[PDB]
Design a binder for this molecule. Structure first.
Ligand SMILES: [Fe+3]
Ligand SMILES: [Fe+3]
Lengths: 193, 193
């Protein structure tokens, strides 16, 4: 009843930054497993007939883990794009200057927060209830979607499966790829939410 | 200042179950990186001069994360060996029969606990203060070393870096490799610590 949504780009569209092989595993195997695990947990529970987001916000344990990781991944994929990356323009550029001083400064901060996020984890740029920007790290399947008022804008997956095939142990090389792939269109869309 | 502990077997000793390449990264890079980071944190702190085990038992945050991972990996390599695996004999066998019913039952319980240990994590067989055996899961850098009177006997590393090169996303396949490599000699030594 939940689907694995198709990626928003072709399997070789992120080359030479993230390989077709990484997509095959990361979307086709990991992301898919969470959909299959969730679909099998919810029959005959209070989460039958709930939306994905409703489940994430009202569950704990295995249901939460699978449901949250489905959302986290689809959001991640939408943060990546061919012919993207580089510097933000528009409303996002100005938000980032207001909050962090410059793109370059925001970039160094986000990057440090990610490289140092311990274990399986996610680093986020979020919009707070009050409207200010923030960089937050979450562990495992946790997500700022469950913090009331907070709007995820951008994320990087730092689980090792996200980069091990292409970058082995080197997160700084993976972050170099991330920045080459950032879909500022999507971040801009989220800013208006 | 700590050093990277030497691997207890040659780089190709665990083939075809765990590759030399995996050992090159997991030992050469990851385990070493924990050493490098610990050494950088401890100068001019109360941890300077302390044994690794004292640091683990008395620290938190980054000092803990790195020190505990050093010990965790050292222990993990000692749990693997060429020409080992299969069924335990003698004292370990009898101890496992009494606590779990049979080796087969303990193996199923330990594999199930491992497969389902969410995120970066470790699965352990431990000896409690009163002499009884138990299976215990820990997340990230945590270790039964910090529970007083508890002696680790056997572990499997379930961080993705440990298996991603050889097994990608499939932990049950890695567990098959684990059981083929368990150094029961080392488990027996641990039963007397
Ligand atoms: Fe992922
Ligand atoms: Fe490891």
């Amino acid at each position: 009843s939940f689907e694995l949504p198709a990626l928003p780009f072709a399997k070789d569209a992120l080359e030479p930054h993230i390989s077709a092989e990484t997509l095959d595993y990361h979307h086709g195997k990991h992301h898919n497993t969470y959909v299959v695990k969730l679909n099998g947990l919810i029959p005959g529970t209070e989460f039958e007939g709930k939306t994905l987001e409703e489940i994430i916000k009202t569950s704990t344990g295995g249901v939460f883990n699978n449901a949250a990781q489905i959302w986290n991944h689809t959001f991640y994929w939408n943060c990546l794009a061919p012919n993207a990356g580089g510097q933000p323009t528009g409303a996002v550029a100005a938000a980032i200057d207001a909050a962090f001083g410059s793109f370059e400064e925001f970039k160094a901060k986000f990057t440090d927060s990610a490289i140092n996020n311990f274990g399986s984890s996610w680093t986020w740029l979020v919009k707070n209830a009050d409207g200010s920007l923030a960089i937050v790290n979450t562990s495992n399947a946790a997500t700022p979607l469950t913090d009331e008022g907070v709007t995820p804008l951008l994320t990087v997956d730092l689980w090792e499966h996200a980069y091990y095939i292409d970058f082995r142990n080197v997160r700084p090389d993976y972050m170099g790829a991330f920045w080459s792939l950032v879909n500022w269109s999507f971040v801009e869309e989220n800013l208006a939410k």
